[PDB]
Design an enzyme around this catalytic site. Structure first.
Site, short mmCIF file in Angstrom:
data_model
loop_
_atom_site.label_atom_id
_atom_site.label_comp_id
_atom_site.label_asym_id
_atom_site.label_seq_id
_atom_site.Cartn_x
_atom_site.Cartn_y
_atom_site.Cartn_z
CD1 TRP B 144 -1.29 -14.40 25.67
CD2 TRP B 144 -0.55 -12.28 25.74
NE1 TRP B 144 -0.03 -14.41 26.24
CE2 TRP B 144 0.45 -13.13 26.30
CE3 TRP B 144 -0.29 -10.90 25.69
CZ2 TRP B 144 1.68 -12.64 26.80
CZ3 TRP B 144 0.94 -10.41 26.20
CH2 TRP B 144 1.90 -11.28 26.74
CD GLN B 213 2.35 -21.11 26.74
OE1 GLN B 213 2.18 -20.27 27.63
NE2 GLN B 213 3.16 -20.91 25.69
#
Lengths: 785, 345, 200, 285
Positions: B144, B213
């Site tokens: 990430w 998301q």
RNA sequence: GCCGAGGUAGCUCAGUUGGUAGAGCAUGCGACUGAAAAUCGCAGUGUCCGCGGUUCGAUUCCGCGCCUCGGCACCA
């Protein structure tokens, strides 16, 4: 029903607390409607014995000589007023309920009435105010209060369901309590009968109307009033007492669902015939009428050699003149099982609602007539003396109940529970069942009175009722639905999503009835109603709606009538019936409409509602055109039919001023489409990045011509690279060659790749110019200015 | 306009003709005989009465009726409008495709017993990767790309309104909220957490800076992998219909053990779409929630509890379903592009 | 309109529990309405509902799989007619709820009415038990009156169900025990009729 | 609702260029990035309108649209983190396409606001109060159910010119707004008293002022109350503005004995005099 | 099936000694009006359930059916 508490405690003693009962029952399934304390006997109402009754000259009154344990007179007017009976004397200075007023010593026609003898209503034990109470003269020590032997009572109004016809008698109920743990005291009325031939016959003609019949014979009858406890009971239940003999007929009816009539043998003839009433037959039905009979009726008749005559209308009324009274000395006791519908129709025909019919229409223990006989005769033998004959006349052989499968675990797999086998056997085995099984499948035979117990499942709610519906645990199911069920919500949500948008849009939802008055067809000039009601609520709520607008406007009117609103933009989406059944969307506009409140100018009318339509349509992903076409109801000049994504689903217009005036209201604009409308899937067009060609023009076209015409032409002559296309200015008059209208168009071209080399927009414009000339449509830069 | 108000005031002249007459006429039989009219019966009680009275009806009902036919005709000449013509220019309106796509996925799952909570965008290292078993100097941190934040003033309220000690950032995944839920509430529950997420990435047609998301979990006693397989399937069915399949393959995720990547068969798409990544939650994520709960004097709740969680980028589906070219579009807030999703239910 | 809020809310409560909402025809046909639900004529069960009996030529009553129906015309007393119209067309298992307008021959006042709206529904499949309905009817009490709400079950009679019951729901702050509805485990004869018809 | 209402949803990044703080004349960014994607995507949004207008501009630059009524609801960071609702109006607005006259500007967007609010079960007032970024003469803060949640106004022409674009009108509230539970008022069946009047009041005065006074002096039996005509000039004593009011009384039981609407009107007349507000049937004509 | 009451306008309704068949309201038009409310001045629509009759208007009476009611006991 109407359940006297003390009375129930007679069959199931150790009951205690009428509230704890009410609770118990509603847990078994019976909804107690009301509980009532009844029998507030004043202290001043004592029991007197009538010694003599002398008339008081040339007047209707009678001067009775009593003894409230100290001989005293009282003058009565009542008919039943005679020596020999017991009465309820309201000593002078006695405050009475139904009376409201207080009794006192008073002078009547020459005599000194020392209080007064009371009627049922007077005392307040039943609504019968036409006659004094009548008790066996030997009843209670002359002078003792009445309250002593008339203890107050609690009576509860149950709600017995249609499947529970055993619950129409105290013992049906009793039996249910017994399943929970209570002791059952079934009275044994064991009589003393001497064997001798009964002096009457019984011939049954229609065995499928009176499947099971019984005639019993008791003679030697000493007809008197019934003992207190029995009067207390009958009233306590909501009945009136007559004579020990008839009371025992009601008493046992109340005790076990069995309607029975005692007929005075005097009027019987040779025997009892049970047949279908022959045409032209009339009977004087007990309540005092001449019910002219129908051949569908079933009748209990008697015959004398030849002629056959009606004695009572089987399973409903009777009485007539064959009725039991004073001089009765022998009777034929009727105890049969009639066919529910042969009664249920006959009684719903003649307008009768008897305790006894009500009982028969539901159904009765098709094997309880014989035991019922015994109760009644033994009762009758005690109370009325009667010597009874050990020999009934049983006509109709009944069949013992069928046995049901019952797998204890099935019962459990169904309830989500886990009651042990043993436990669940007892439940039935003590609900009075024949459980003849080794296990796992048991085979149970229900007692005769449980008609409601056919299937194995009837049996499971029997186990989960005694056990308690409060012992079935909560649990939730987890599962993969079957493939075909997957998606069925979709049509629905699309309709619900439409009400939402119709709402944020700016429409106030209305709901109107689906009943249409036939009348409107003419007022609204529409095709005649397809369906009509056979039993309308009103001549005006006679047929059903072929359209929604009649009601929408109707509804609107009622609002002016009440609220004087200034505008309204409603909408409705109910079911519409004609030919088939459809879902429709309608709504009407009205009043001033949008604009500024402190500005003298509004923006409204047709184009308002027409704009709200396109606003809606666009936000729906659908195409919308209104083409002209006068409709019967709309206004001739402003009427067109709605065209969604190519097709005609409805209309949009104003109202025909005939009707406007016809209905006292002003101009309204409305529409009615039919649902569902279509759904056009997402066509994702990627837009270009290179600018667009902003060109522009105007067309002359003949006055009575349409916009959608010029516009459809412009658009398909514009070719593929046209983008927008909007009318931005209309013109009526000169500098135009009289009788034409200049429609101005903002055009717009764009290439989805490179830009537009201009000379290309030109040749494009050439075809548009061309097709206008090829139609009779002149320009600005070429044909009129 | 012309013949309407003219005669409606002019018939009212007749309404005033009925009572200027009604008085003289009522001022004969009623004034010459109130008590003494049934004494003056024939001639007088028949002439000025019966006779003149029928005038007070025929002329009333005629100026009242013979006016509607001529006035109501004057309106038939007036609104001779062009039915088709752009009507009032109201604003259309309409949603954005992430909203349709998000809400649709929010429904699919709610319909499966799931609740939707929403978390903070500006997170704090502890809550974001850390509490989800991602300590520093971990090549897991390298999966990430964090926008690390800096500024004074901002108060990062955690779960039960208490302020948080940690390093500030923009949530890479919506999981930070998976833990913020578990401290505040007790099991069991089925929840789905949608939201905007932020990666330090190179914006192009398939990759992006900002994104959305939807992740979620279901924790409670007895939850098993079979359950996540169950759900992730139901999502494939309700999204691509009854000939859709799901595929599970193991993969690595710090917060889950076991872990996997679901791929869904897209019947008519002919390809095996990817979609998300999920797995049975890790034991150490339960310890952190309880450790924290205790810090807040909140009895521990996840001792004997099992639990799966899943996560899938909305952003993708929104392109597969609503067929879109590049990811940049959504955030490139363009009108003619957005205007194609105003019509979607 | 408040029926819409109230309806949709109840449609959500249940959809959220895995339920689907289908909608049936208003103008039904004796067979489908009371009959198929174990309510034969001359039955004091017929007396529990007051039917507007219909008459008119033209109307084509398409049943389940678009096929036309033989029966006597009327206005649906309860939404159950659609409980069977679903079962012929589809295969189990499923969890569905059928909302709609219903029509009784009754005396309009403050507490009673001519037209009304009901929501009924079922869940059929292998292994469903009473415990399950107790489970659901509860979840409805929780989502409607919050976490201190209780449900009560007492037996009652209904032709289409065996066993049968009437649910009552505790309304915490309402202080009273609200009534609400009536439900039960579907009757074996209702399954026979659906299958009998399916075979037809 | 914001959608069926008539607003096209937009989504903008949450990154703000520090720069804007000056262009839009707003308080300095609270958080900044340690590794921004670009100097312009350096700090995060304290407001949504910077982007909403920004976004709008890019549309003129590309599509030359005539009007637009968008709305956005993203996360806003400053001090704490909040959800905000914003949207801007622009262009010609509503009206007729083949009619030379439109209906738009501030009252358009102001109307769309009340339209929205009502359908929300909430109370909505715009009181004046210039905000740094808005236009001095057309700027007020939004008041929902008693409280101040945001603003509504135009744009400060400095910025309009600064950003090459023309007039725009916008608002930015903070969510969640409140929720007022259903107060079921049963309406009466007996008709209502339709009386009416007008007030003179000094030029630079507000509507919400006259109106709040009228309404609480009207007592309990007032029902509606709507401005239906405004007046600037003579026959008025120079420098006043006649505001016309459609009144409306109704008793939730028996009807209104008229002399009662009168004494009611008396208090309204009274409180106008007790403020310097003359009438029509009493103070100026 | 029953014993007695109501049904009057654009709402609500007292309702008789019938004389203005209304009163509260509310409705329209001509002066005042940039424009509306009070005042002015003026008159009204109203199948009084629907229909048979009666006085002048047909609601004071008397018919059958209607719509709403209080008491006769069992119904998703």
């Amino acid at each position: 029903m109407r359940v006297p508490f003390s009375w129930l405690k007679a069959y199931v003693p150790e009951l205690e607390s009428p509230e704890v009962l009410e609770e118990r029952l509603a847990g078994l399934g019976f909804e107690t409607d009301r509980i009532e304390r009844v029998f507030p006997i004043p202290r001043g109402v004592v029991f007197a014995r009538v010694l003599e009754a002398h008339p008081i000259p040339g007047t209707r009154l009678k001067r009775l000589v009593l003894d409230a344990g100290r001989t005293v007179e009282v003058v009565s007017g009542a008919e039943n007023a005679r020596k020999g009976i017991g009465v309820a004397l309201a000593l002078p200075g006695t405050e009475l309920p139904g009376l409201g007023q207080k009794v006192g010593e008073r002078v009547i026609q020459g005599v000194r009435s020392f209080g007064m003898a009371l009627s049922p209503r007077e005392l307040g034990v039943g609504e019968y105010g036409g006659g004094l109470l009548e008790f066996p003269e030997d009843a209670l020590p002359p002078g003792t209060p009445l309250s002593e032997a008339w203890p107050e009572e609690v009576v509860l109004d149950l709600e017995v369901t249609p499947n529970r016809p055993d619950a129409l008698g105290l013992l049906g109920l009793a039996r249910d309590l017994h399943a929970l743990g209570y002791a059952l005291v079934e009275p044994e009325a064991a009589l003393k009968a001497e064997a001798l031939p009964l002096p009457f016959a019984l011939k049954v003609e229609d065995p499928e109307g009176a499947p099971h019949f019984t005639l019993g014979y008791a003679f030697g009858l000493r007809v008197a009033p019934s003992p207190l406890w029995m009067q207390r009971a009958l009233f306590a239940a909501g009945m009136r007492p007559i004579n020990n003999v008839v009371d025992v007929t009601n008493y046992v009816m109340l005790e076990r669902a069995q309607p029975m009539h005692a007929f005075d043998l005097r009027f019987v003839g040779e025997g009892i015939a049970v047949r279908r009433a022959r045409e032209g037959e009339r009977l004087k039905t007990l309540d005092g009428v001449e019910r002219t009979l129908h051949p569908e009726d079933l009748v209990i008749a008697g015959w004398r050699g030849e002629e056959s005559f009606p004695l009572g209308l089987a399973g409903v009324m009777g009485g007539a003149e064959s009725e039991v009274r004073e001089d009765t000395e022998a009777i034929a006791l009727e105890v049969a099982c009639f066919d529910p519908v042969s009664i249920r129709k006959t009684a719903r025909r003649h307008g009768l609602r008897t305790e006894a019919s009500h009982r028969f229409e539901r159904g009765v223990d098709p094997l309880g007539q014989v035991p019922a006989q015994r109760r009644a005769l033994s009762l009758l033998q005690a109370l009325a003396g009667a010597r009874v004959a050990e020999a009934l006349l049983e006509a109709g052989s009944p069949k013992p109940p069928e046995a049901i499968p019952f797998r204890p675990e099935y019962a459990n797999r169904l309830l989500g529970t886990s009651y042990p086998e043993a436990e669940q056997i007892a439940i039935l085995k003590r609900l009075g069942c024949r459980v003849e099984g080794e296990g796992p499948t048991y085979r149970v035979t229900p007692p005769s009175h449980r008609l409601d117990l056919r299937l194995e499942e009837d049996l499971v709610e029997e186990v989960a009722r005694i056990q308690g519906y409060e012992t079935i645990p909560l649990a939730l199911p987890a599962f993969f639905p079957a493939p075909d069920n997957r998606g069925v919500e979709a049509p629905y949500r699309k309709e619900q999503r439409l009400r939402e948008v119709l709402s944020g849009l700016g429409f106030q939802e209305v709901y109107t009835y689906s009943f249409m008055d036939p009348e409107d067809a003419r007022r609204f000039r529409l095709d005649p109603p397809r369906l009509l009601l056979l039993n309308p609520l009103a001549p005006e709520k006679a047929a059903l709606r072929t359209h929604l607008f009649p009601g929408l406007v109707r509804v609107l009117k009622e609002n002016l009538d009440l609220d004087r609103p200034e505008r309204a933009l409603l909408f409705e989406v109910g079911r519409v019936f004609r030919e088939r059944e459809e879902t429709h969307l309608a709504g009407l506009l009205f009043g001033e409409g949008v604009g500024l409140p402190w500005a003298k100018e509004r923006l409204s009318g047709y184009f308002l509602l027409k704009g709200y339509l396109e606003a809606l349509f666009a936000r729906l992903g659908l195409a919308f055109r209104v083409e002209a076409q006068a409709f019967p109801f709309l206004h001739p000049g402003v009427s067109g039919r709605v065209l969604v994504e190519g097709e005609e689903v409805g209309f949009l217009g104003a109202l025909h001023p005939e009707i406007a005036q016809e209905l006292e209201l002003p101009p309204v604009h409305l529409f009615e489409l039919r649902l569902p409308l279509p759904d056009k899937p997402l066509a994702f067009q990627d837009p270009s990045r290179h600018p667009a060609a902003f060109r522009d023009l105007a067309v002359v076209v003949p006055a009575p011509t349409p916009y959608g015409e010029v516009e459809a032409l412009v658009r398909e002559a514009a070719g593929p690279y046209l983008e927008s296309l909007a009318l931005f200015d209309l013109y009526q008059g000169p500098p135009l060659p009289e009788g034409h209208k200049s429609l101005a168009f903002h055009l717009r071209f764009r290439h989805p790749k490179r830009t537009l080399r201009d000379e290309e927009v030109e040749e494009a414009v050439s075809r548009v110019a061309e097709a206008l000339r090829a139609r009779g449509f002149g320009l600005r830069g070429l044909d009129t200015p | 306009l012309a013949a309407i108000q003219n005669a409606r005031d002019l018939e009212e002249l007749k309404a005033l003709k009925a009572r200027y007459l009604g008085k003289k006429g009522l001022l004969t039989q009623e004034m010459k005989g109130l008590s003494a009219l049934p004494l003056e019966e024939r001639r007088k009680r028949g002439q000025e009465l019966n006779a003149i009275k029928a005038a007070l009806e025929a002329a009333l009902e005629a100026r009242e009726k013979a006016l509607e036919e001529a006035a109501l005709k004057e309106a038939l000449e007036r609104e001779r409008v062009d039915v088709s013509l752009p009507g009032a220019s109201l604003f259309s309106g309409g949603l954005h495709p992430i909203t349709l796509m998000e809400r649709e996925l929010v429904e699919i799952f709610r319909a499966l017993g799931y609740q939707a909570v929403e978390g903070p965008e500006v997170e704090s290292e502890f809550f974001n990767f850390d509490a989800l078993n991602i300590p520093e100097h971990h090549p897991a941190r390298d999966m990430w790309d964090t926008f690390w934040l800096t500024g004074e003033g901002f108060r990062l309220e955690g779960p039960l309104g208490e302020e948080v000690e940690g390093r500030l950032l923009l949530r890479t995944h919506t999981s930070p909220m998976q833990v913020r839920y578990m401290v505040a509430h007790t099991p069991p529950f089925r929840i789905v957490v949608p939201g905007r997420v932020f990666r330090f990435e190179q914006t192009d047609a398939t990759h992006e800076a900002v994104f959305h998301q939807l992740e979620g979990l279901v924790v409670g006693e007895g939850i098993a992998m079979a359950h996540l397989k169950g759900a992730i399937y139901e999502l494939a069915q309700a999204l691509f219909g009854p000939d859709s399949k799901v595929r599970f393959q193991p993969v690595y995720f710090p917060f889950v053990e076991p872990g996997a990547q679901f791929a869904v068969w897209w019947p008519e798409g002919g390809k095996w779409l990817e979609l998300g990544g999920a797995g049975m939650v890790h034991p150490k994520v339960f310890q952190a929630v309880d450790a924290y709960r205790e810090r807040l004097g909140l009895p521990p709740a996840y001792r004997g509890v099992t639990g799966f969680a899943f996560g899938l980028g909305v952003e993708r589906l929104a392109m597969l379903r609503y067929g879109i070219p590049d990811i940049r579009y959504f955030f490139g807030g363009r009108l003619k592009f957005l205007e194609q999703f105003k019509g979607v239910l």
